[PDB]
Structure formats: structure tokens, C-alpha cells
Write an enzyme that holds these catalytic residues in place. Structure first.
Site, short mmCIF file in Angstrom:
data_model
loop_
_atom_site.label_atom_id
_atom_site.label_comp_id
_atom_site.label_asym_id
_atom_site.label_seq_id
_atom_site.Cartn_x
_atom_site.Cartn_y
_atom_site.Cartn_z
N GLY A 143 -35.44 87.35 54.64
CA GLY A 143 -35.61 86.49 55.80
C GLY A 143 -36.93 86.71 56.49
N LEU A 144 -36.95 86.42 57.79
CA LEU A 144 -38.13 86.53 58.65
C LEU A 144 -39.22 85.52 58.30
CD1 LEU A 144 -38.61 90.40 58.97
CD2 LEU A 144 -37.19 88.91 60.39
N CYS A 145 -38.94 84.56 57.43
CA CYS A 145 -39.95 83.59 57.03
C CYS A 145 -40.13 82.47 58.04
CB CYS A 145 -39.58 82.99 55.67
SG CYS A 145 -39.56 84.19 54.33
N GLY A 146 -39.30 82.42 59.08
CA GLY A 146 -39.38 81.34 60.04
C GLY A 146 -38.62 80.13 59.55
#
Lengths: 232, 128, 129, 285, 128
Positions: free
Chosen positions: D88-91
Site C-alpha cells: 500500500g501507501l501508493c495513494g
């Protein structure tokens, strides 16, 4: 100082840590038995700060300009002490440690240093325009500092790389060769009026000076001196 | 006297000039000299003989789609290995290069990223 | 000696966020991070073991120069202790020389420079970490 | 809000900011190396691009335009390839690509074409498992520098399905790297329908030793695999760039929240000092 | 009955952020998250509806002996209420049996373990 002011002379009054004047007043009030006020400060904080810093004015005969070092308690500027000091301030100069890491010449942070008189009506339209443009360029560099640190100079597009280079050169051109200095560097003293400074920075922002590299702006002083340094 | 491009999807290994090259084509081994007529071909497992100024370096090729032209020659090989001298620089290749990829580039780096994602999550909900 | 130490420690304090990510970083950033880690481990000291100025300046000259790079981080304290024992026993002359001309404005003079470099090189060759 | 809970909050968000800045830096290095990998893969891709253009220039008859080159009529089954970040954390990147995949499934089912999913990356796999679609082909744990051998398990399966009539068309959904900051999902056709490029116009006559049909049937699958590899590397680069932007935004937001929490902490500190001095003065009097 | 409850709830409280937006957990962290959510939903009780000791003993025995694992999270309050209604009506003898020997040192007597696990199984099969 008021004797020389009454003599018609212009006097500069330096007060070291006006906050220590505030704290001395607080201690005197506490010892006198007066009730405290809002951080434990003296109830007569405004009146005491008005007794001082109100004889510091420009009268018809003479004038006492002033420069007061201010220790903000912790980082709270809203603290009654720096707040009542700011109530009586016409300009602020912010010496910052990060620029002080290498710039032992005046390390004033141009973005954090403001001045009430820097308005078109007083210092003129040209000075205001030049100062606002310099601050805009330096703010653009401040915004792109993280990008430069992370990405690099290549991802940064055209029309901003010019402004980043110009901001480097102009932050370097906030150096002044002093008549009197600590650890005297030998450079001749120079006294640059505002009339010279405004036009010099205007020309630096007008494309001229893009040829000389950024590192040769240490204590140059004037744009005519910039051209002279480039000639050599 | 012609420029040969040893092209693999992962990387281009050689784009140099070669005196003579032998194509292990499916129908049978073929040799190519610089002014060869246009040709396309399917290579097979075997030895790719990059004969450059007298030195035959046999490169192991598991497959190819070699394109030949009078001015250029190019192979699009699925897998190309030196298979000639000192194996394949085993000093680091397939060893330090392999470990640096499976561990440094994959294992420890992902462990650190998971640690950071974590420390985020925990200290994010310590705000609440 | 300690100006470069102060600068490098400031740079490491700036880059301390990336320490856990030392693997995936630029070469210069990595060099700075491990240099700062070496310096921080060097400043670690035991109790009731004050160091005379000659020992401190010799150690910090070794650290500021790229002489402790081959030393792993968790062995920097042992390296310092062994090196100071070496200078105390094997080479008292260089210690006395460093102490004698500690007030020279251009302190790294060629004589003390080469004596200290020779002592450090001899210690590094004799020992292994 | 007692001038000590706010201090703990400030420490927490400062830790958040440091971690997020470190993530941004490593994601920048990741994007650098992923762009390097894409550029290093570019020669194979473009060389095979003009090779395919030249080959399909000669093979123009419908009778010999068979196997992978055939333009099938009455499309009945369609397969779509999705490449997603493993983490995750990709927006909005994962949400954007999955929205594009979902809507594309919507139109493909609107025309009556049954749809089957082939997914790279754990995010798309998990999303399509949760929504209902069983992953026909599943591939995860692809590093930042995947090898083409790692994609075979899905690409060969898709090509065999197309050959066997199982899928009448093939698509891929990947995150195009338009800029360092701007990335959008993109759709690409995997049935060749090659371009009459200058190579197709090029009339250099060739010789096909194993045979024109054999060379065609052996090169079309490799061309498709090259296209999928290009898409996967493009998606890896876009993943790292999107994570960079997301972490930069998160660091800026954390700094803003630190500023606000510092203001609140200062207000609480002043209030506490005022309260204690007022109580002490009242007690003295 | 309550020691396992307290321990599992403490473990779940330790595992807070992972439940709520960490999606890369095994079924070891996630197992504790699930069980803790089960127990927390079990404690949700309306107003003016006190439960005697035997009722809470039976419910917590069902929850802590894995007899409630398959029940989804939002339906656990209704599961508890339905199990109690079944226990008032279908088997009051098991309630009497629990209440009579709630003071013995080893509460899960085979006479009590039987006819309580049996009632739990009957309710599980009959309902849902």
C-alpha cells in the site's frame, strides 16, 4: 540617548534581550506582592513595556532608532512577553541557525525577517517591487528545496532551474563587506545605500549576472562591483 | 565488419562489432558474414559463437529471433550467458550480484520497509 | 581536528531519518550515515575513564580521516581502547609529541602528522577487526 | 489536552514525519532504478516492435493471418491483465487502476462478453478475490526489478487461453508513467493489430528459414510477453513514483499537524502556568 | 471461565492498529483480532437487562471454547440473546446445573461439561 536626540542627532539604541527587562519587571512585581498576570508575569506588563519603547520615537528635533534582541520564552511567540514586545515593534530580523552553519556573514533569514515600513507608500514603488521579487524567488527555492534534495536538478523543469540558480546567487548576494568585523577578512569596507541596493538587486533579477558562477558572490557589495568582479 | 546487438529483455549485453557469428537456427546451424542477405530465424539451445577478431566466445543461447540485414544484425534472445571463460564472472555475478538482489535488494530492504510501515501505523494510532 | 567531527555529526543528525534504510541509498549518503554512526560510537565512553587531550585528539584525527572505515560500527569502542593502549605502551613518543605541540596554530605539522599516521597504520596492520 | 498528552502527540507526529520522509527518499531511489530498468528494457521492446511491423507488413492475407495475429469476429470471452502494487501507501494509484478495471469489466459485460481476471500484485489479487472473481492467474512477490521469467506463469497461460479459443481478446491495465508526479491508469490491446509503421512501409524483403508461419507463431507470443513486461516495469516505476508523492504529501501534512499541535501545546502550557500562579496567589491571600 | 477472556482481550487491545488498516497479517495476529472482536461484541449489553451468574458463565464458556468462532462479528449480540432464550426455554436444567455447582474448585465438571456443550451444539445446529 535622549540627550543626543535632543541635540538633533540620530541615535541608535541597542537593548540586549528586552525579554530580560520583562523578566526583571516580573520579578520586581512578584517581590512587591502584586498579583500575577497570565503567565505569572507582572500585571503592569503593557504599561512597563510602554514606558520603555515609547520614548524611542522620531521627534521633530531628533530621533532614537532602536534594535532590541528578544529571547522568545521556549518557542511561544504568543507568550505575553514577546507578544507585548511585538506590539511595539516596527521591524523583525530573524537570524537562523541553519543558514548560520556556513553563512557567518549576516545570516538573516529573508523569509522570516519582515518590516512594517516595507510598503510602496514609504520606501517607494521600486524598492517594494524588488523586495517582493527577491522574496518570491527565495520562497520558490524554499519550496523546491525538498525536491532538489530528493529528486535532483534534472527533474526540475525549465523556467524554475533558472530561478533556483538565481535564488542561490541572491542568497549569496546578501553578503556585505563590513568596515568593522569579527575576524576581519581583509575585504575593504563598503556602505551601500538603499538607492544602490534596490537597483543592484533589480539588475540581478533582470538577467544580468547569470554568467558569473554562484560561489564568487562572497562579500561583493554592489552590482557595479559585480560587473567589476566579472571583468576580472 | 558489422555491428551485432546481443539484446535480452533484461538488458543489452553487447552492441559491439563482430567479425563472424554462428546462428544455431532450428533447421540447422548457420554462419553469418557481414554482408549477409536479409534473414529472420529461430535459434535453439546451443552455443552462440561470437567470433570477434579471431577469438570464438561461445555464448549459451536458449532461444533467439535473429534479424539480419546487410548493414546491421540483431538478435532478440530470451537468455544469453557468456558460457565461454571464467564461467560468468561468478566472483560476483550469480553470487554477490544474486545475494545483493535476493537479500539486499529484496529481503533486508523489504524488512526495513515493513518496519517503517509498522512504526508509522503504531505511532499514527498513538495520536488517537 | 574537531571541526570536521562537528560538521559530520551535524550531517548525520540531518540524515538520521534514513539510518534504517542504509541499504537502499546513494553512495555518498551511505558514506555519511556510516561515518556518523562510527563517530557516535566513538563518542561513547565508559565511566571513570577520562581521556587526556593527546589521546582524544589522536583518536579524533584517526576518525576524521578515513582511517576507521574498515572498522565495523559495534567495534569502534574496542578499536579506540586498543589503539590508546597501543599508543600508551608501544608509542609513548607520538603521544608526548602530540601533547608538546598542541598549541601550534597549524597543529597538523609534518612531524606529528607522519608520526601519528605511522602509529595508526601500525596499529591497523597489527590488529584485525 | 493537558500540556503532556499534547507533548506525546507532538512526539508521535514528529516520528510520523521522519518515517514518511525516509519513505519518500527510498521511494525516490526506487523510482530512479526502476526508470533505469525501463530504459534498459527499451531496446528489446522497440527492436521487436519494428520487427513485428516488418513481419506483419508481409503477412497481409487473411488466410495466413492466423494463430495470434487473427482478428477474431464475434468476440465472446475477454481477458484483462491488471498490474498493481504489492504494498500500500501508493495513494490513489491502486484505487485508480482498480476503478478502471472494474468499469472496463462493466462495459465488457454490457456487450455480453464474459470476463476473466489475470492479476499481478497482491492488491489487485485481494480486491478481485474479495469482490468475487477467482484469479485465473495469480503472480505476487514481484520485486522492483522483476525478470521476464517471473511473468511467464501468467503470460503463457493467457496466450494458451487465447490460442484455445477460451479468450477472444486480451487487454492489460497498467499505471502509465506520464510524469514524476502525474500517473494515470491506461488500457492496451494485447491482440496484435500491429501498426503500418515505417517498418510496415519498409519493403526490405526477407528470408524465413524455419518458415514464415513458424516464425510468426514463435514471435507473436514473445512480442506479447515483451509488451506485458514493458507494462509491468512501467507499473513498478509508477508505483514508486506514486508512493513518493503520497509520502511527500504525508510528510507535509504531518509537519502541518505538528505546527497545529505545537500551537495547542503552547496554549495549554500558558493556561497551566496561569492556573497554578492564580491558585498560589489565592492561597497566599 | 474469565481468565482466557481477560488474556485474549488484553492481546487484542495490544493488537489495535493491525486490525483496523493493516491488511498484510497472517492468521495468527488476525486470529487474535477476530477473537477479541468476538469477545468485545459479547460484552455489548443493553440497559435494564442484567444476566445472572449462570448465564454469563454459559455465554463465556461458549465464547472461550471456540464454539462461537464461526459466528460473524455483527451478529454476536443476537447470538448471545438467542442462546440465552434457548437456554431459558429449551434447557432450564442446564442453568440449574450450572448454578448449583458454580462454587466447586474445578467448575467444568464432566456432568457440567456435558449437557452444556451438548446444549451449545444443539443451538448451533438448530439455529443458522
Amino acid at each position: 540617548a535622549e540627550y543626543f536626540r535632543d541635540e538633533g542627532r540620530d541615535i541608535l539604541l541597542f537593548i540586549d534581550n528586552i525579554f530580560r527587562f520583562v523578566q526583571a519587571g516580573s520579578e520586581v512585581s512578584s517581590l512587591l506582592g502584586r498579583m500575577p498576570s497570565q503567565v505569572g508575569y507582572q500585571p503592569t506588563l503593557g504599561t512597563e513595556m510602554g514606558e520603555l519603547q515609547e520614548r524611542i520615537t522620531s521627534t521633530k528635533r531628533g530621533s532614537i532608532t532602536s534594535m532590541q534582541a528578544v529571547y522568545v520564552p521556549a518557542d511561544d511567540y504568543t507568550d505575553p512577553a514577546p507578544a507585548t514586545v511585538f506590539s511595539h515593534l516596527d521591524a523583525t530580523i530573524s537570524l537562523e541557525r541553519s543558514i548560520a552553519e556556513r553563512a557567518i556573514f549576516p545570516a538573516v533569514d529573508p523569509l522570516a525577517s519582515t518590516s512594517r515600513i516595507l510598503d510602496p507608500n514609504i520606501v517607494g514603488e521600486e524598492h517594494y517591487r524588488v523586495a517582493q521579487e527577491v522574496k518570491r524567488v527565495l520562497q520558490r527555492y524554499k519550496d523546491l528545496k525538498d525536491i532538489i534534495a530528493i529528486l535532483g536538478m534534472e527533474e526540475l523543469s525549465d523556467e524554475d532551474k533558472l530561478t533556483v540558480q538565481r535564488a542561490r546567487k541572491i542568497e549569496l548576494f546578501f553578503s556585505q563587506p563590513f568596515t568593522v568585523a569579527q575576524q576581519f577578512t581583509g575585504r575593504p569596507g563598503k556602505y551601500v545605500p538603499v538607492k544602490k541596493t534596490v537597483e543592484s538587486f533589480a539588475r540581478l533579477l533582470n538577467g544580468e549576472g547569470d554568467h558569473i558562477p554562484e560561489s564568487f558572490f562572497y562579500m561583493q557589495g554592489d552590482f557595479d562591483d559585480v560587473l567589476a568582479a566579472y571583468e576580472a | 565488419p558489422i555491428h551485432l546487438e546481443i539484446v535480452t529483455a533484461e538488458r543489452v549485453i553487447l552492441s559491439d562489432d563482430v567479425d563472424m557469428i554462428s546462428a544455431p537456427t532450428k533447421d540447422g546451424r548457420v554462419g553469418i558474414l557481414p554482408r549477409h542477405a536479409p534473414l529472420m530465424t529461430i535459434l535453439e539451445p546451443g552455443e552462440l559463437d561470437i567470433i570477434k577478431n579471431g577469438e570464438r566466445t561461445p555464448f549459451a543461447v536458449s532461444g533467439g529471433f535473429m534479424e539480419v540485414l546487410p548493414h546491421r544484425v540483431t538478435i532478440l534472445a530470451d537468455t544469453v550467458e557468456r558460457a565461454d571463460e571464467i564461467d560468468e564472472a561468478r566472483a560476483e555475478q550469480a553470487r554477490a550480484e544474486a545475494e545483493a538482489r535476493r537479500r539486499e535488494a529484496q529481503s533486508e530492504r523489504d524488512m526495513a520497509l515493513a518496519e517503517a510501515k509498522l512504526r508509522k501505523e503504531m505511532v499514527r494510532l498513538r495520536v488517537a | 581536528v574537531a571541526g570536521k567531527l562537528k560538521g559530520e555529526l551535524a550531517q548525520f543528525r540531518d540524515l538520521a531519518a534514513f539510518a534504517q534504510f542504509a541499504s537502499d541509498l546513494d553512495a555518498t549518503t551511505k558514506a555519511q550515515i556510516e561515518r556518523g554512526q562510527r563517530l557516535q560510537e566513538l563518542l561513547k565512553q565508559p565511566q571513570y575513564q577520562p581521556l587526556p587531550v593527546e589521546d582524544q585528539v589522536a583518536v579524533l584525527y584517526a576518525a576524521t580521516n578515513n582511517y576507521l572505515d574498515d572498522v565495523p560500527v559495534p567495534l569502534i569502542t574496542k578499536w579506540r581502547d586498543d589503539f590508546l593502549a597501543f599508543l600508551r605502551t608501544a608509542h609513548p613518543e607520538v603521544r608526548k609529541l602530540i601533547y608538546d605541540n598542541r598549541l601550534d596554530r597549524k597543529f597538523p605539522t609534518p612531524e606529528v602528522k607522519e608520526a601519528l599516521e605511522a602509529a595508526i597504520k601500525e596499529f591497523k596492520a597489527t590488529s584485525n577487526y | 489536552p493537558s500540556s503532556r498528552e499534547i507533548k506525546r502527540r507532538i512526539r508521535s507526529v514528529k516520528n510520523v514525519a521522519q518515517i514518511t520522509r525516509a519513505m519518500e527518499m527510498v521511494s525516490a531511489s526506487k523510482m530512479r532504478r526502476a526508470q533505469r530498468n525501463v530504459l534498459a528494457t527499451r531496446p528489446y521492446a522497440d527492436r521487436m516492435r519494428e520487427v513485428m511491423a516488418n513481419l506483419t507488413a508481409r503477412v497481409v492475407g487473411a488466410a495466413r493471418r492466423g494463430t495470434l495475429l487473427e482478428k477474431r469476429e464475434t468476440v465472446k470471452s475477454v481477458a484483462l491483465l491488471v498490474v498493481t502494487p504489492d504494498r500500500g501507501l501508493c495513494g490513489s494509484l491502486v484505487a485508480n487502476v482498480l476503478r478502471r478495471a472494474g468499469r472496463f469489466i462493466t462495459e465488457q459485460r454490457a456487450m455480453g462478453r464474459t470476463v476473466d481476471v489475470y492479476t499481478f500484485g497482491r492488491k489487485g489479487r485481494d480486491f478481485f478475490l474479495r469482490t468475487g472473481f477467482a484469479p485465473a492467474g495469480e503472480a505476487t512477490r514481484l520485486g522492483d526489478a522483476p525478470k521476464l521469467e517471473a511473468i511467464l506463469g501468467v503470460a503463457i497461460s493467457a496466450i494458451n487461453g487465447f490460442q484455445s479459443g477460451k479468450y477472444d481478446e486480451l487487454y492489460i491495465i497498467y499505471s502509465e508513467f506520464i510524469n514524476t508526479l502525474v500517473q494515470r491508469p491506461a488500457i492496451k490491446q494485447l491482440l496484435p493489430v500491429e501498426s503500418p509503421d515505417i517498418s510496415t512501409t519498409t519493403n526490405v524483403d526477407y528470408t524465413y528459414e524455419p518458415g514464415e508461419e513458424e516464425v510468426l507463431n514463435s514471435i507473436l507470443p514473445r512480442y506479447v510477453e515483451t509488451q506485458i513486461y514493458q507494462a509491468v516495469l512501467e507499473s513498478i516505476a509508477s508505483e514508486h513514483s506514486a508512493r513518493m508523492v503520497a509520502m511527500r504529501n504525508a510528510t507535509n501534512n504531518a509537519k502541518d499537524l505538528v505546527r497545529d499541535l505545537t500551537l495547542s501545546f503552547n496554549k495549554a502550557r500558558q493556561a497551566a502556568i496561569t492556573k497554578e500562579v492564580s491558585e498560589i496567589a489565592s492561597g497566599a491571600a
